[model samples]
Target: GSSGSSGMLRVIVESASNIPKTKFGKPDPIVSVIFKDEKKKTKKVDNELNPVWNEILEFDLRGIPLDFSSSLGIIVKDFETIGQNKLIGTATVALKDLTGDQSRSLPYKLISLLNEKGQDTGATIDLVIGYDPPSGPSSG
Candidate 1:
């Protein structure tokens, strides 16, 4: 759905640390990376929490507004084979908060948004974010 010259954003899901265990026991986690209306997910981790993905999710910025207000949402879930996936927590990365024009590496803590409890589980997710475009153009 690229109209012409468009940008791309990469979310490198490195790993998660200190996440809580599930009711059944050790939980395999799947990470959801969201930007604008676009959503991408990392493959389920084979092991338990403190998952390592080091996976890159690609998002072509065709119709998205690339601005300071734009933010990336990270939702961590405990993968379920039979029932619904369990929601672990949520985190966000602000575009304007990055140190560079297109790349940053940071760890974001997950917070509960299920109802308004807004609990920080101390479950941190490590990530690397980068931006790209078709050609050389001055960013405004």
Candidate 2:
């Protein structure tokens, strides 16, 4: 059993469309990625219905307990200065769907708030994921 693998997992939050605004104007949406109790966030896209992040989020596989079968949670929230922030939408992406070194762009339907009566908020997020295998090993 010599089979083995390790690399860095990177995800790009390309953009989102038709996101609902909880405030008086268009929403200031911030994206969050949660995996195994760890979370990372992207800067807010202000007053935008169609927001483009094109931001890359990276995770070192050697530092975390994860695999292709693991699920990563993505949450889009309305950023606010005052009061509690609102949940614009949410989506869970299975790492299994994103495999190999070649990058893939996939869209996830942003699950609307349950308080919205189980309706699609016309929101969706585009993501691209890639894997870079360990370059060489053990200098020490």
Candidate 3:
């Protein structure tokens, strides 16, 4: 099999909106993008409803390979003192046919495990993932 792929995976963490609060107060939300075993996380934001992190993360694909069936995990959680982090929302995007070498930026809706209809988390994680195989001999 002779296939070529991008050498880098850039995760542009734009921001989040309508993030829910904790039991009594606001939450310190942290964004995490996971590709297989490799996970890139952002610093937790201070107490706020809607937090903005315009942080960019780079994941070098030196030995790993990108399969179209493999999905990207965009998970948002609250910083916890005890135990693991609390889940605020999460979204999954499949890496299929993403060969277009354009700056593709889009908002991924974060949903909760309790999806009944009214139990909507009402949050979305904005991001721009760049992992295009460089096109050759394009116009300058």
Best by lDDT: 1
lDDT of 1 by residue, 1-140 (tens): 42454567778877787777867777887788887688788988865878888887888775343567777887777777426644677777786665334445454444332312457766777777765544344332
Please give the distance, in angstroms, between residue 56's alpha carbon in candidate 2 and its true position after superposition.
1.2
lDDT of 3 by residue, 70-132 (tens): 567877777763266456777767666443445343444453322223355777667777664
RMSD of 1: 4.8
Off by over 4 Å in 1: 1-5, 63-65, 81-85, 98-116, 133-140
Error (Å) of candidate 2 at residue 6 is: 4.5
Using TM-score, give the best candidate's number. Answer: 1
Task: Identify the runs in model 2 with alpha carbons over 4 angstroms from their true place.
Answer: 1-6, 63-68, 81-85, 99-119, 132-140
Which of the two, 1 or 2, has more TM-score? 1
Model 3: worst 10 consecutive residues (lDDT sum):
109-118
Give the Cα error of residue 34 in candidate 1, in Å. Answer: 1.1
lDDT per residue for candidate 2 within 14-129, as digits (tens), equals 78887776548787888889754568888888888888888888876762333587777787777764256456777777777655454444554454422124456668777765
lDDT of 1 at 125: 76
Clashing pairs in 2: none
Give candidates' CA RMSD values in order: 4.8, 5.4, 6.3
